[PDB]
Design a protein around this ligand. Structure first.
Ligand SMILES: Nc1ncnc2c1ncn2[C@@H]1O[C@H](COP(=O)(O)CP(=O)(O)OP(=O)(O)O)[C@@H](O)[C@H]1O
Ligand SMILES: Nc1ncnc2c1ncn2[C@@H]1O[C@H](COP(=O)(O)CP(=O)(O)OP(=O)(O)O)[C@@H](O)[C@H]1O
Ligand SMILES: Nc1ncnc2c1ncn2[C@@H]1O[C@H](COP(=O)(O)CP(=O)(O)OP(=O)(O)O)[C@@H](O)[C@H]1O
Ligand SMILES: O=S([O-])[O-]
Ligand SMILES: O=S([O-])[O-]
Ligand SMILES: O=S([O-])[O-]
Ligand SMILES: [Ca+2]
Ligand SMILES: [Ca+2]
Ligand SMILES: [Ca+2]
Lengths: 458, 458, 458
């Protein structure tokens, strides 16, 4: 009797799970929204520099209109190798945000110290790996909360808390190839192993070296650490990057997971549109909404407010096929990256609508309980849209100078709705709905043309 | 000199042969239609229950319009494993009929007894395998005839005869996890091996156990049996499920095989339409035509009559892009499962045309020599349409409560054209073309709304 | 720590390189056009017979409109095996021209003799391999020049010189399974190894046998020869057909390589159109342009003239979406195979435009310095268009009786623009723009209907 080889089965549930972390794939939580959960772990925030400039350059005529295709190939080639190192070292990629990602090693507290050593080693192997593009890495460790929010058809998650805020601080202060440890990371870690320098005006710290003691054996140390990693592929599945590669069809799980993924993506997953259709350099409008709270680490207070905000944002965006691309925590606050003009979703009057939608969101969210300040940046132009990451873990994302600009506007011009010149000039609206603003110098943007506040009709 | 690995070549002839059994792939028969051939073998008729109810439920809004996609994934996941067991045990899957299949082990008579033991073991391993869904299995053994019929562009085949009628009886009388043997099966089999119970009002029989004698070794027994299996993958190809995976391009064979497969399928095979396009929950009209004969086991009489009927049915269906989905033998008669509204084939006035086409078929076929009774059931609604089975053996099929309803109407209301309420209400036709019928209780249907006879214009 | 298997990555740069030889993939030459380079090597020109007749026959109704699909499958099945033998024996496939290909073994002069023995052995293994279709093979050895020409968006290359002219002569004089060696090939080769016959009225020669001396061991001899093959897959990559299978994304290289490949092909490479869309039997018009020179082996003279011609041809074709399918050297001259009606590029008035474009090209090119004679054949009808070759090395090509006819017209009616009856009858133009020509018997065409010269408006 023959025993023929099982072919890899590439079921839709497996393709959907590529878009999600293990935290969600194997999470099985309740129905209620907001849902919150609490744990400890180590975070790695890996940021690549030089890609939005490449994006700008790949719009140039030398790429003969294969700009999007060439950009995504070279981006995925580099990012895939980072993703693979993270997975092999036992991390869960939580989210891609443009050309950056955030990864988690969830463990019990007693194991944090040993796991911090695993993540440092991983970081230094990634730095190793590095077209003129650098990588900055922040690491943090401690308490983390997860929030899941949404409605009957859509779900979103976020991590929140002091380690989350720390990991962004640590990354922001890194020079152009540094691994920086949060102060808490630095004090929980195994100091006899790691050689650091102080850094100016902060107790956060820079890693120079991993100097293991005499007969420390990393492979034995790692194996010990795997005892505490729930989903590390092993045994018969040790040749796989992710256990989620082995998920089997299960309608109830697939219904829960698909809510996290955008419809146009699901369509490609179902072999109902060409795989190449979602990689594009297209003109869109970014509406970047920032919500700040009294205490942004306190998930039981902020969770309800984010749910409330999401219910309203989703309904006004729907009126324009606008879409939420991603949600995440910034140093200040919860940010919704919203996009008008995603593929097949091109209403004309995009700019006008982007502005009215932004005002509506600003007015509603301002009155939501616990939301201290709302800030919204609106910028318009040619951005890269596409699937970024590795075949086994990847997400739909947007990269471009205009995405960066909208993000910086909401930070540098808090408490108001701001817009760029393309949006101002291109909108239908009367000029006195706007106020021209003082020019501010902003991190990693040059030649923002004039900026405007969208005042509305006083 | 390098010896690089041959890549699996997935030629169109290989993809076409996935849709056909070995009986046809390696058959090489004459041109004439009808063609008949005679042999012996064992049949297994495996029926899954619970799928048309799942079909109904997957139309619900909780599946967020990925109903068809989720249904086909979970159906193929389970059905694939059954297909694989059948192939590994050396069977030929002849046909899929909704959520049921029919499999054949063709052998010389002297070998029937030993082969019956192989098929029982296979059946019990399939029962093993079993969302709330059961499997019933009928087995039969003895004489089988095959009929091939059609025209210059289309071919169809059917198995006919006493073992065929038996295998349906045996399956129909099974409780909700039984393996039932036909009476002839029971008397040809190796009684010292198999432990049965009698069943009420029949000499057909239920298998409880396979109790091999002391040093019976199944693997050695199976290998002996493979001597009599012409196409069992072996040698260099022993890691394959089917020898048809190794077919090489051959224009003459491919022209003969493609006649059995629907054009829209061929289009996907040729990479001229998206693979996902044929999995759908769509509104269609089922026209189920049943032909009964004096003697339905006598292939030399009935073959000409089925050919004649097919020539006419095909021409009237063509006038409406109606399509024959499948043909097979029921307990009484030869059934054509015809469908109006298959993809890209959506004439409006579908219902009216379904009725006129049915009357035309009824009038012509009634006068064909040797056809004793014609019965036709017409039902309309949302049915699943798609490719069911395993990657190496699969077929386009329709599953749904309306498919079941049309099948039961033609059996419970013999000799007339019947239709459901959707068809009656939705058609263009005047009310006095119909007669409202007495309500009958019918196997595995509830809430058939009112039923009508299509009388035509007296 | 796991070491999971790297998946084959099928990056766009790798798919583009399938369309090109190593001579271009690993060439890295300057920007300037024309670019010329000089080397030595052995050429093999493998011609299949019987395919354009199969093409004709696959338009017949017996193929049920899957003619193109069946033709390409059976063509690629046979051609793939030839390609594979050529690659395994260390050759570079330079170009496909319908159902023929040209392959190169580039080496230093001292190694030519040993390499000639490798190529003969390869030839005899290919002859081995051979629906009623024969293979003729010409071999030549010596000096070869390569010309690269084009503009900012498109590149083309050609090999030129005495070995190139020789390899076509040798192939043209072969009977219907011969391997013929050019005279220069015959005198550089290892005469103690190869058993030949003379052939009528030529010092070119026919191979009967390879009779290696007593303890000649071909595998050891081949390995020695691999020392001189720059890109022979080896080591970790010895299970690959081509080293180009390992190319990694690199925007600068990909921009240079994509210029050689047609846009519609790039679109399929980018997963923006169905793979099956480019295999078709479609009506097109072939415009075959032949340029002759005083000395066609002298690349420093002819290179500028071909560049000049190309700049003009490309601009007039653009005005009609006409396309250059391929360029190559014929026994006399440089030929541009141009096509009107490639997919998505179907202007009506195709025939008229094909004629005016041809006249324009004829008038301009006639005055280009160093171009002695221009000849252009225009023929219209159903031709096969599609990707021919092996998965790792393949090209878009056209095959058909009309392609052959246009090629023969430009040779048998030199110095003028000629057209077939379909073109004459179907064009819009007044009858006195044409002159009906004397009927000539032409190699491998029968029933060319009447032929005409396109005179233009005197
Ligand atoms: N797709 C995305 N998702 C979330 N945030 C994004 C984003 N694209 C841009 N941003 C935000 O825009 C800001 C850009 O500033 P930086 O991160 O310092 C740019 P950089 O990494 O030095 O080089 P780059 O522009 O080549 O990416 C960040 O705050 C980042 O969070
Ligand atoms: N695609 C198909 N091809 C052929 N016959 C079909 C069919 N779909 C339904 N039928 C017919 O419809 C009838 C349905 O009755 P049953 O077979 O008893 C239903 P069941 O198996 O108990 O559960 P189910 O409805 O979940 O399938 C059968 O006679 C069957 O032949
Ligand atoms: N796609 C293509 N590219 C370049 N030249 C082509 C071509 N198709 C046809 N030709 C030319 O047309 C002519 C055809 O004549 P032959 O090569 O003798 C035909 P054959 O090989 O005996 O059988 P065939 O017609 O089945 O191919 C050749 O000069 C060839 O160069
Ligand atoms: O990674 S969470 O802040 O979206
Ligand atoms: O399996 S045969 O009755 O179509
Ligand atoms: O092979 S070169 O003459 O195009
Ligand atoms: Ca960045
Ligand atoms: Ca069933
Ligand atoms: Ca040829």
């Amino acid at each position: 009797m023959n025993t023929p080889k099982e072919e890899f089965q590439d079921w839709p549930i497996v393709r959907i799970a590529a878009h999600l972390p293990d935290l969600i794939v194997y999470g099985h939580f309740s129905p209620e929204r907001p849902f919150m959960d609490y744990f400890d772990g180590v975070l790695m925030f890996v940021d690549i520099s030089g890609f939005t400039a490449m994006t700008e350059k790949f719009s140039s005529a030398m790429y003969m209109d294969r700009g999007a295709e060439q950009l995504v190939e070279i981006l995925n080639y580099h990012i895939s190798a980072i993703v693979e190192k993270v997975l092999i070292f036992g991390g869960d990629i939580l989210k891609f945000a443009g050309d950056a990602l955030l990864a988690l090693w969830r463990v019990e507290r007693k194991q944090l110290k040993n796991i911090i050593t695993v993540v440092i080693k991983c970081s230094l192997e990634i730095h190793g790996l590095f077209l003129d593009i650098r990588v900055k890495i922040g690491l943090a460790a401690g308490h983390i909360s997860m929030l899941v929010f949404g409605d009957e058809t859509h779900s979103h998650f976020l991590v929140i808390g002091q380690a989350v805020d720390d990991v962004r601080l640590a990354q922001n202060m890194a020079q152009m190839n540094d691994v920086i440890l949060s102060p808490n990371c630095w004090q929980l870690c195994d100091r006899s192993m790691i050689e650091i320098e102080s850094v100016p005006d902060q107790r956060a710290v820079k890693v120079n070296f991993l100097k293991p003691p005499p007969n420390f054996n990393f492979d034995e140390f790692f194996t010990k650490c795997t005892t505490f990693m729930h989903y590390y592929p092993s045994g018969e599945h040790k040749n796989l990057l992710r256990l989620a590669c082995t998920l089997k069809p299960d309608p109830e799980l697939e219904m829960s997971l698909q809510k996290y993924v955008m419809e146009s993506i699901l369509k490609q997953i179902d072999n109902k549109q060409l795989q190449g259709y979602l990689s594009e350099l297209r003109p869109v409008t970014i509406v970047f909404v920032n919500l700040m709270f009294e205490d942004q680490d306190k998930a039981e207070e902020i969770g309800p407010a984010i749910q409330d905000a999401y219910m309203h944002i989703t309904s006004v965006l729907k009126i324009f096929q606008g879409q939420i691309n991603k949600v995440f925590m910034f140093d200040k606050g919860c940010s919704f990256l919203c996009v008008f003009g995603f593929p097949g979703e091109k209403v004309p009057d995009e700019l006008t609508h982007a502005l009215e939608c932004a005002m509506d969101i600003f007015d509603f969210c301002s009155q939501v309980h616990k939301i201290q300040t709302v800030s919204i940046g609106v910028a318009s132009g040619i951005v890269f849209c596409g699937i970024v990451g590795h075949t086994v873990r990847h997400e739909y994302t947007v990269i471009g100078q205009k995405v960066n600009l909208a993000a910086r506007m909401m930070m540098y011009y808090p408490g108001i709705v701001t817009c760029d010149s393309v949006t101002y000039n291109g909108s239908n609206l009367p000029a006195y709905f706007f106020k021209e603003l003082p020019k501010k110098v902003m991190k990693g943007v040059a030649d923002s043309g004039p900026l405007y506040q969208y005042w509305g009709r006083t």
